[PDB]
Design a protein around this ligand. Structure first.
Ligand code: FAD
Ligand code: FAD
Lengths: 163, 165
């Protein structure tokens, strides 16, 4: 239980979709998250868990709102990039055609995603080495159903789906 | 459209998940199906689940203060359905049947054939609208044989192929 590689392994038995959480503002940023969870319908709430030592932890608190893009299976590379701590953190990357801007927050939203969310930060709860960020939905939108990106047993997987 | 439940649930459904059964032991053992299960922290080892305020498990979790979590394999769809059924028989005797083990630390039922088992002590229960977020500190955790996983996506149950090398 004290071993990270082992415990991460047990955790990996639970399959997930994959998202990219984003902020806009002066210093736009993006990161890959699979801790995304639908929480409540009234009021409409979701949550994500972000490492305390991660840059997005501070950005979320600074900006107070965020975007979420649920990734299709052909967006594995997007998932990989924004999980990469060594990545370019340059705001120019979000001006590329692969990004849309949320109508409500201006947060980057990944084109081709299965779905988009914009949220206002409702609360941030302590949770050990992570914090639980609860967002109240401002906008939400589902796109064409197609194969979904899935993360299971530490592997990226494609989940077939069609309307 | 955010005011419409079916519309919004449809959008939420675009995010695929595995499926668990959350359980308590004690005098009135109980179980419920949950896909809001999420790994939260490694130090200390924490997980969370989101449980409806009006759901019976909401009270059981608070009353008993510890719980089990079983991650379901693809051939356990019927388990997911059963313990998602509000009309289900609620006799505690069912958790004495052979498809269940009892967690050594919590006595919570754990489903045999599951991909993984967790036992947890309730750390905190946080308000979250019509749900509460229950954060559990792990007392035990154990991974079993890798095999096809139960996945819930687009409001459908799916099998996700998986096998040890
Ligand atoms: C499928 C997948 C799902 C994921 N889900 C989540 C999730 O739900 N929640 C979550 O928090 N993460 C998650 N991650 C990991 C996350 O995507 C990466 O950690 C990402 O790079 C974090 O972005 P960041 O800018 O917010 O934090 P970063 O600044 O990139 O920090 C990431 C970690 O690396 C350390 N670090 C980074 N750069 C340095 C540096 N120069 N020097 C010293 N230390 C450094 C940090 O201390 C931190 O612990 C996931 C990754 C994958 C592949
Ligand atoms: C893949 C899947 C994933 C799921 N994930 C979650 C999750 O993460 N969190 C969660 O909370 N649920 C989740 N559910 C639903 C949950 O499993 C069911 O609601 C289950 O019945 C709850 O069990 P319970 O005894 O704890 O609550 P219950 O007592 O069964 O109540 C469940 C709901 O039904 C109502 N209800 C039941 N009986 C009555 C009654 N006599 N009179 C009036 N109202 C009644 C309650 O108002 C309540 O809203 C999921 C279901 C599925 C199929």
């Amino acid at each position: 239980l004290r071993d990270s590689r082992s415990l991460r392994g047990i955790f990996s038995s639970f399959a997930t979709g994959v998202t990219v959480v984003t902020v806009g503002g002066d210093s736009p940023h993006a990161m890959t998250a699979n801790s995304f969870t639908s929480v409540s319908l009234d009021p409409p709430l979701i949550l994500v868990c972000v490492e305390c030592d991660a840059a997005m932890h501070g950005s979320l608190l600074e900006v107070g709102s965020f975007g979420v893009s649920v990734l299709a299976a052909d967006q594995q590379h997007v998932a990989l990039l924004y999980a990469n701590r060594w990545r370019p953190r340059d705001p120019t990357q979000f001006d590329r055609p692969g990004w849309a801007r949320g109508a409500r927050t201006g947060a980057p939203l990944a084109r081709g995603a299965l779905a988009w969310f914009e949220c206002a930060l409702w609360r941030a709860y302590d949770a050990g080495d992570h914090s639980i960020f609860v967002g109240r939905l401002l906008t939400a939108e589902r796109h064409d159903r197609r194969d979904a990106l899935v993360y299971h047993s530490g592997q990226f997987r494609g989940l077939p789906d069609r309307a």
